[PDB]
C-alpha cells in the first residue's frame, strides 16, 4: 500500500512521512473560508487489489503554527465534516484498485475575529494528518503521516 504526493514523493509499505507543499489562497478575509484541498495532492493505491482490500481512515489531524492560533476550523473526509484538530476516528474507506485513488481530505479553515496580519508564514507547518491502513488479510496496522506546509503567506485583511 504505497501512497504518493503530487510532487513525486512516496511513502513505502509500512509507513513513514512525506512533506506536502500546498498552495493556499493569497488572502482570506474574515467571515469567509479557506480550502486546503489534499485530494489533489495525496494519492494512494492498493498493491494487490485482486485478493486484499485496504481500509484507510484519518486517525489524527493536528494543527500547527498560525493555524493553531488564528485559524480554528474543520476537516472534510468523504463528505463528513469533523472538528480540527480532530477529536475522533473518521470512518473507513475501501481501497481495492491498482490505480491511484485520491485521499478525500479537505481542510476548511476560517479566520477568527483576530486581525492576524500574516496569519500563516510561508514554509511553516500548518497541518499534520495521519492515515491508518489495516487490511482484511492479517493483523496489520500502518501509519502514513503527512506534514502540510504553506507555500505563500495567507494574509488576513485587517479591515
Amino acid at each position: 500500500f504505497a501512497c504518493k504526493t503530487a510532487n513525486g514523493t512516496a511513502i513505502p509499505i509500512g509507513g513513514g512521512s512525506a512533506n506536502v507543499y500546498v498552495n493556499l489562497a493569497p488572502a482570506v478575509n474574515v467571515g469567509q473560508n479557506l480550502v486546503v484541498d489534499l485530494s489533489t495532492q495525496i494519492f494512494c493505491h492498493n498493491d494487490y487489489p485482486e485478493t486484499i482490500t485496504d481500509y484507510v481512515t484519518l486517525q489524527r489531524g493536528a494543527a500547527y503554527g498560525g493555524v493553531l492560533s488564528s485559524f480554528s476550523g474543520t476537516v472534510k473526509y468523504n463528505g463528513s465534516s469533523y472538528p480540527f484538530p480532530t477529536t475522533s476516528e473518521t470512518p473507513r474507506v475501501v481501497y481495492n484498485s491498482r490505480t491511484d485513488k485520491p485521499w478525500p481530505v479537505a481542510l476548511y479553515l476560517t479566520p477568527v475575529s483576530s486581525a492576524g496580519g500574516v496569519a500563516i508564514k510561508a514554509g511553516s507547518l500548518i497541518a499534520v494528518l495521519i492515515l491508518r491502513q489495516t487490511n482484511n488479510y492479517n493483523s496489520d496496522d500502518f501509519q502514513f503521516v503527512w506534514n502540510i506546509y504553506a507555500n505563500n503567506d495567507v494574509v488576513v485583511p485587517t479591515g
Epitope: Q59, S88, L125
Partner: antibody
C-alpha cells in the same frame, strides 16, 4: 506500553541552566506532539510549550519564552528542556506529556522532574 | 486570552452523595476541546474525561461530564473514597491553552 519517563530530581545552582529529559517508548517517536508543563502549590498547572518531533516545530506559552527551549534528538527517542537564567521562583515539578492517539488531549504523562533551585 | 475559572476549588462530599464541579470559561469554547484530568496529590495527572462528555479508559462510569459553550461542569454520582483528588479543566485547540485553577474534593466520613 507507551511511557514518558522523566528523571526523578534535578538540583541546579541559581543563575545557571539545567537540562532535563523525557524518554518516550512504546510508539513511533516522530508522530505525536510532546508537551511540557509545570506544577506548583501556587496557581495551577502552567503549559510550558510544545514540540512536534517530526519537524522540530516548537511553540512556547507566552511567558516561559526566554526560559524554555524544547529540543528533541529523534535518535534515542528523547525530548529535552533546558532552563535559562534559572531563579528561585522556578522550583517546581515538571511533567512531559503526549497527546492522545485520536485527539488533542493530554493522554500519557510522566513521573515528573522535581527541580529545586538552591546552592 | 481565554481563561478558565474553577468555581468551588474546595468541596466536601459524603461517601454516597452527588457532587458537581463547574469550570467557567472567559469566552465561548467549542465543546470538543475541554478535558478534565484527575491528579491525586503526590502523583501525575491522568486523563479522566475528553470532549467534555466521553470517559477515559479505565475510569469508573460514575463521572458524567456535561455542559457546552461557557459553563462545562462535572458530576460524580456515587462519590467513593477514591475520588478525593484535584480535577483540572484544559481547553486545547486555541494555542494559549489553559489549566484554570483546580477543585480538591474532600470525602467526609
Amino acid at each position: 506500553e507507551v511511557q514518558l519517563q522523566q528523571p526523578g530530581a534535578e538540583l541546579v545552582r541559581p543563575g545557571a541552566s539545567v537540562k532535563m529529559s523525557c524518554k518516550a517508548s512504546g510508539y513511533t517517536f516522530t508522530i505525536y506532539n510532546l508537551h511540557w508543563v509545570k506544577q506548583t502549590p501556587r496557581q495551577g498547572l502552567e503549559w510550558i510549550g510544545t514540540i512536534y518531533p517530526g519537524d522540530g516545530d516548537t511553540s512556547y506559552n507566552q511567558k516561559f519564552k526566554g526560559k524554555a527551549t524544547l529540543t528533541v534528538d529523534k535518535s534515542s527517542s528523547t525530548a529535552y528542556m533546558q532552563l535559562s537564567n534559572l531563579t528561585s521562583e522556578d522550583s517546581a515539578v515538571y511533567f512531559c506529556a503526549r497527546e492522545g492517539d485520536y485527539g488533542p488531549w493530554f493522554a500519557y504523562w510522566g513521573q515528573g522532574t522535581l527541580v529545586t533551585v538552591s546552592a | 486570552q481565554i481563561v478558565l475559572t474553577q468555581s468551588p476549588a474546595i468541596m466536601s462530599a459524603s461517601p454516597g452523595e452527588k457532587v458537581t464541579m463547574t469550570c467557567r470559561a472567559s469566552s465561548s469554547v467549542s465543546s470538543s476541546y475541554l478535558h478534565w484530568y484527575q491528579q491525586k496529590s503526590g502523583a501525575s495527572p491522568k486523563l479522566w474525561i475528553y470532549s467534555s462528555s466521553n470517559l477515559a479508559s479505565g475510569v469508573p462510569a460514575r463521572f458524567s461530564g456535561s455542559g457546552s459553550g461557557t459553563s462545562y461542569s462535572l458530576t460524580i454520582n456515587s462519590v467513593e473514597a477514591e475520588d478525593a483528588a484535584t480535577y483540572y479543566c484544559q481547553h486545547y485547540g486555541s494555542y494559549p491553552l489553559t489549566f484554570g485553577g483546580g477543585t480538591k474534593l474532600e470525602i467526609k466520613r
